[PDB]
Amino acid sequence: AAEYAVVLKTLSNPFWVDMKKGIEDEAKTLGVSVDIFASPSEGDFQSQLQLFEDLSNKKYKGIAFAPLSSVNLVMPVARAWQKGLYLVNLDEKIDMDNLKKAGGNVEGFVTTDNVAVGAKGADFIINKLGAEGGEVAIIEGKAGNASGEARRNGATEAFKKANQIKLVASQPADWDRIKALDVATNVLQRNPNLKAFYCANDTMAMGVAQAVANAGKIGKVLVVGTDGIPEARKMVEAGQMTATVAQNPADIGATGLKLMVDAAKTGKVIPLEKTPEFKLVDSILVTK
Ligand SMILES: O[C@@H]1[C@H](O)[C@H](O)CO[C@H]1O
């Protein structure tokens, strides 16, 4: 039973696979042991809460977590903090009002400037479509995912401010490749003049690229993803996707572990209500 535990989401999303690897490799530099668990893609809020409670009961020094929802891990995170575990919030911000009410805190929150992500993707699309612009659509993450919402707002605002761009559709595909395919299929059907998709992540971007291929419209309709997973990078090189706004999940993981280990060294968990340490990891546009 390692010194530290991490709870990540489905390894069916290479984003979480790369964050896992990043964490293992940092652990090797720091010389600490980590146990890493991934929630099944179909696992419900309750089932992640039970895992965290169960990890909380073992002899872990700290737990880092990417929560299924802003609220689902409030009570178990508050109970781990109460026990004096060093807690780090990865990717998606836990509801800090509800965490306060529950008498808990976390040491730190490690994430990407996700407004900037969405803006970067939209700005790339606006610059690419040039003077004539045209109709664009957004394939959203799961409802209530703050990081997805940030990308949606960032992109939407960029599109709004460009007079030559009309956002014709904005619909969730819940981080799921197959749902993204089905949704993108229907959008194309309803908008024969569609020029581009922005997609809040790469599993959805890859579904959307398949929908564009199905309609025989590769190169004709732009597809911009987010995360920079290998298969999306491959698609970009091959010209099946236009671009992706790369995150660095390996760095989000490494930085989160380091924050948890550093916190532990002081021998004091962060006091309640005190704003956790905030660490931003860069994003970059990748194109062909
Ligand atoms: O930032 C992460 C990644 O974009 C993942 O692909 C979907 O969930 C988001 O919160």
User: Structure tokens of 51?
Assistant: 């895992």
- Going from the Cα of 240 to the center of ligand 1, the distance in angstroms, rounded, reads 21
Atom of ligand 1 nearest to the CA of 202: 6
d(CA 167, CA 98): 35
Pick from 8, 90, 91 the residue to mutate for probing ligand 1's pocket: most ligand atoms within 8 Å of its CB. 91
- Going from the Cα of 114 to the center of ligand 1, the distance in angstroms, rounded, reads 10
CA dist list (Å): 146 to 129, 190, 212:
28, 28, 28
Q: Nearest-CA neighbor of 85 among 165, 175, 3?
A: 3
- Going from the Cα of 15 to the center of ligand 1, the distance in angstroms, rounded, reads 7
Q: Nearest-CA neighbor of 90 among 257, 274, 225?
A: 257
- Going from the Cα of 110 to the center of ligand 1, the distance in angstroms, rounded, reads 13
Q: Is the Cβ–Cβ distance between 172 and 186 less than 8 Å?
A: no
Note the maximum CA span of the chain.
61
Beta strand ranges found along 25-71 (DSSP E): 34-38, 62-65
Which residue do the tokens 């930085």 mark? Answer: 255
Q: Is the Cβ–Cβ distance between 142 and 175 less than 8 Å?
A: yes
Pick from 10, 13, 39 the residue to mutate for probing ligand 1's pocket: most ligand atoms within 8 Å of its CB. 13
State this model's resolution in angstroms: 1.9
Atom of ligand 1 nearest to the CA of 175: 7
Atom of ligand 1 nearest to the CA of 200: 4
Q: Is the Cβ–Cβ distance between 234 and 253 less than 8 Å?
A: no
Domains of the chain: 4-112+249-281 (3.40.50.2300), 114-246 (3.40.50.2300)
Pick from 139, 147, 231 the residue to mutate for probing ligand 1's pocket: most ligand atoms within 8 Å of its CB. 147
d(CA 187, CA 144): 22
d(CA 9, CA 37): 8
- Going from the Cα of 118 to the center of ligand 1, the distance in angstroms, rounded, reads 13
Q: Nearest-CA neighbor of 49 among 63, 33, 35?
A: 63
CA dist list (Å): 282 to 31, 40, 120, 175, 201:
26, 28, 12, 21, 16
Beginning with the edge strand found earlier in the chain, give each strand of the sheet holding 34-38 in spatial order.
Answer: 34-38, 4-8, 62-65, 86-90, 108-111, 277-280
- Going from the Cα of 267 to the center of ligand 1, the distance in angstroms, rounded, reads 32
CA dist list (Å): 124 to 130, 140, 174, 226:
10, 18, 23, 12
Residue ID of nearest Cα to ligand 1 atom 6: 201
Q: Is the Cβ–Cβ distance between 113 and 283 less than 8 Å?
A: yes
Beta strand ranges found along 62-159 (DSSP E): 62-65, 86-90, 108-111, 134-140
Residues with CB under 6 A from ligand 1: 13, 15, 91-92, 141, 145, 147, 175, 201, 226-227
Pick from 139, 152, 201 the residue to mutate for probing ligand 1's pocket: most ligand atoms within 8 Å of its CB. 201
Q: Which residues contact 111 (CB under 8 A, 6 or more apart)?
A: 90, 91, 92, 93, 147, 252, 279, 280, 281
Q: Nearest-CA neighbor of 38 among 73, 59, 62, 13?
A: 13
Q: Whats the size of the chain, residue-wise?
A: 288
Backbone phi, then psi, for 235, in 5-degree steps?
Answer: -60, -40
d(CA 86, CA 106): 7
Q: Is the Cβ–Cβ distance between 211 and 181 less than 8 Å?
A: yes
User: Structure tokens of 102?
Assistant: 């529950």
| Amino acid type, 49 | L
Atom of ligand 1 nearest to the CA of 92: 10
Q: Nearest-CA neighbor of 148 among 176, 108, 190?
A: 176
Q: Can you tell me whether residue 135 is helix, strand or coil?
A: strand
- Going from the Cα of 268 to the center of ligand 1, the distance in angstroms, rounded, reads 31
C-beta atoms surrounding 105 within 10 Å: 23
- Going from the Cα of 226 to the center of ligand 1, the distance in angstroms, rounded, reads 8
| Amino acid type, 126 | I
User: Structure tokens of 125?
Assistant: 């699309």
Residue ID of nearest Cα to ligand 1 atom 10: 147
